[PDB]
Design an enzyme around this catalytic site. Structure first.
Site, mmCIF file in Angstrom:
data_model
loop_
_atom_site.group_PDB
_atom_site.id
_atom_site.type_symbol
_atom_site.label_atom_id
_atom_site.label_comp_id
_atom_site.label_asym_id
_atom_site.label_seq_id
_atom_site.Cartn_x
_atom_site.Cartn_y
_atom_site.Cartn_z
ATOM 1 N N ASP B 25 0.779 -1.222 0.000
ATOM 2 C CA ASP B 25 0.000 0.000 0.000
ATOM 3 C C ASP B 25 0.818 1.283 0.000
ATOM 4 O O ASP B 25 1.296 1.725 1.037
ATOM 5 C CB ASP B 25 -0.908 -0.054 1.226
ATOM 6 C CG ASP B 25 -2.051 0.918 1.164
ATOM 7 O OD1 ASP B 25 -2.054 1.825 0.311
ATOM 8 O OD2 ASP B 25 -2.961 0.766 1.995
ATOM 9 N N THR B 26 0.877 1.934 -1.156
ATOM 10 C CA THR B 26 1.615 3.182 -1.310
ATOM 11 C C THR B 26 0.865 4.376 -0.703
ATOM 12 O O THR B 26 1.432 5.457 -0.518
ATOM 13 C CB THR B 26 1.923 3.464 -2.791
ATOM 14 O OG1 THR B 26 0.701 3.640 -3.514
ATOM 15 C CG2 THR B 26 2.671 2.288 -3.393
ATOM 16 N N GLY B 27 -0.416 4.187 -0.425
ATOM 17 C CA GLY B 27 -1.199 5.248 0.176
ATOM 18 C C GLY B 27 -1.109 5.177 1.689
ATOM 19 O O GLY B 27 -1.723 5.979 2.387
HETATM 20 C C1 LIG Z 1 -2.473 3.165 6.497
HETATM 21 C C2 LIG Z 1 -3.248 4.225 7.236
HETATM 22 C C3 LIG Z 1 -2.317 5.053 8.102
HETATM 23 C C4 LIG Z 1 -2.548 6.504 7.870
HETATM 24 C C5 LIG Z 1 -2.706 6.797 6.388
HETATM 25 O O1 LIG Z 1 -1.489 6.722 5.661
HETATM 26 C C6 LIG Z 1 -3.558 5.488 6.314
HETATM 27 N N1 LIG Z 1 -3.822 5.212 4.890
HETATM 28 C C7 LIG Z 1 -5.062 4.972 4.432
HETATM 29 O O2 LIG Z 1 -5.956 4.498 5.132
HETATM 30 C C8 LIG Z 1 -5.332 5.360 2.972
HETATM 31 C C9 LIG Z 1 -6.147 6.656 2.915
HETATM 32 C C10 LIG Z 1 -5.487 7.855 3.563
HETATM 33 C C11 LIG Z 1 -4.369 8.471 2.988
HETATM 34 C C12 LIG Z 1 -3.791 9.606 3.582
HETATM 35 C C13 LIG Z 1 -4.360 10.116 4.771
HETATM 36 C C14 LIG Z 1 -5.488 9.499 5.377
HETATM 37 C C15 LIG Z 1 -6.041 8.361 4.755
HETATM 38 C C16 LIG Z 1 -6.161 4.244 2.274
HETATM 39 C C17 LIG Z 1 -5.403 2.915 2.137
HETATM 40 O O3 LIG Z 1 -4.286 3.210 1.313
HETATM 41 C C18 LIG Z 1 -6.073 1.647 1.532
HETATM 42 N N2 LIG Z 1 -7.047 0.924 2.362
HETATM 43 C C19 LIG Z 1 -6.362 -0.371 2.535
HETATM 44 C C20 LIG Z 1 -7.195 -1.288 3.447
HETATM 45 N N3 LIG Z 1 -8.534 -1.455 2.887
HETATM 46 C C21 LIG Z 1 -9.041 -2.705 2.576
HETATM 47 O O4 LIG Z 1 -8.267 -3.661 2.566
HETATM 48 C C22 LIG Z 1 -10.493 -2.936 2.280
HETATM 49 C C23 LIG Z 1 -10.798 -3.623 1.103
HETATM 50 N N4 LIG Z 1 -12.015 -4.095 0.870
HETATM 51 C C24 LIG Z 1 -12.991 -3.953 1.769
HETATM 52 N N5 LIG Z 1 -14.113 -4.673 1.491
HETATM 53 C C25 LIG Z 1 -15.385 -4.105 1.012
HETATM 54 C C26 LIG Z 1 -15.969 -4.932 -0.170
HETATM 55 N N6 LIG Z 1 -15.992 -6.378 0.182
HETATM 56 C C27 LIG Z 1 -16.555 -7.206 -0.902
HETATM 57 C C28 LIG Z 1 -14.622 -6.873 0.472
HETATM 58 C C29 LIG Z 1 -14.055 -6.124 1.696
HETATM 59 C C30 LIG Z 1 -12.720 -3.241 2.959
HETATM 60 CL CL1 LIG Z 1 -13.966 -3.024 4.143
HETATM 61 N N7 LIG Z 1 -11.488 -2.728 3.190
HETATM 62 C C31 LIG Z 1 -9.229 -0.190 2.742
HETATM 63 C C32 LIG Z 1 -8.388 0.661 1.774
HETATM 64 C C33 LIG Z 1 -9.091 1.957 1.511
HETATM 65 O O5 LIG Z 1 -9.043 2.864 2.343
HETATM 66 N N8 LIG Z 1 -9.718 1.994 0.303
HETATM 67 C C34 LIG Z 1 -10.518 3.154 -0.128
HETATM 68 C C35 LIG Z 1 -11.143 2.895 -1.505
HETATM 69 C C36 LIG Z 1 -11.668 3.363 0.862
HETATM 70 C C37 LIG Z 1 -9.646 4.414 -0.266
#
Ligand SMILES: C[C@H]1CC[C@@H](O)[C@H]1NC(=O)[C@H](Cc1ccccc1)C[C@H](O)CN1CCN(C(=O)c2cnc(N3CCN(C)CC3)c(Cl)n2)C[C@H]1C(=O)NC(C)(C)C
EC number: 3.4.23.16
Lengths: 99, 99
Positions: B25-27
């Site tokens: 995860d690059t985000g």
């Molecule tokens: C790491 C943290 C520390 C501090 C920040 O750096 C922080 N980063 C982040 O949180 C960043 C956003 C951010 C960036 C900067 C500042 C604040 C926030 C998002 C992250 O990169 C990705 N994140 C990975 C986990 N993930 C899943 O696995 C996932 C996948 N699928 C699901 N589902 C739903 C359907 N089902 C069928 C099957 C399961 C569910 Cl519930 N969940 C959710 C996903 C996410 O957020 N996706 C979006 C579309 C909503 C964006």
């Protein structure tokens, strides 16, 4: 270009005549952007991650110009803390992860 | 290796002699792992995702092998949907975004 991960990978994207800055997120399945008005009809959707779920509006087939590269795809508009570009649009500009 | 984003960029990590699935995860600024037992003491940290903030346990100097690349860094443990490898560990294994 080759983007490094020392800092957050923010790029300039253009959408709806507005220039915005967004994060290239490989962990994001969808592309979520901050509240704005997009033409066309929308569909309500819930997306979650760490922190929980949020309600967004799903606009289909929108054009986004990511660093000059044009891309078409689904765009979710809602109360996100930062504009994020997900895998749906990243694939269209040929973005890859190397190491 | 080169990774395309058509599918979720999941890799096998080895932490504590156990294999786990993790998302490149690059985000993610930080590496957030699921609930497990890690050695040493821990400090508190608040991290904000898409749905808000959560509390996690911060463990420092933890060895984690990501795709055969060893990395020693800070790992956070808390309520997360999946094991997340953030920029802090990606920079160690020399991960970049290209396009
Ligand atoms: C790491 C943290 C520390 C501090 C920040 O750096 C922080 N980063 C982040 O949180 C960043 C956003 C951010 C960036 C900067 C500042 C604040 C926030 C998002 C992250 O990169 C990705 N994140 C990975 C986990 N993930 C899943 O696995 C996932 C996948 N699928 C699901 N589902 C739903 C359907 N089902 C069928 C099957 C399961 C569910 Cl519930 N969940 C959710 C996903 C996410 O957020 N996706 C979006 C579309 C909503 C964006």
């Amino acid at each position: 270009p080759q983007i490094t991960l020392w800092q957050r990978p923010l790029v300039t994207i253009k959408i709806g005549g507005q220039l915005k800055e967004a994060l290239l997120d490989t962990g994001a399945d969808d592309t979520v952007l901050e509240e704005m008005s997009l033409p066309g009809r929308w569909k309500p959707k819930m997306i979650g991650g760490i922190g929980g779920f949020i309600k967004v509006r799903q606009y289909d087939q929108i054009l986004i110009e990511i660093c000059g590269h044009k891309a078409i795809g689904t765009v979710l508009v809602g109360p996100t803390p930062v504009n994020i570009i997900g895998r749906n649009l990243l694939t269209q500009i040929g973005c890859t992860l190397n190491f």
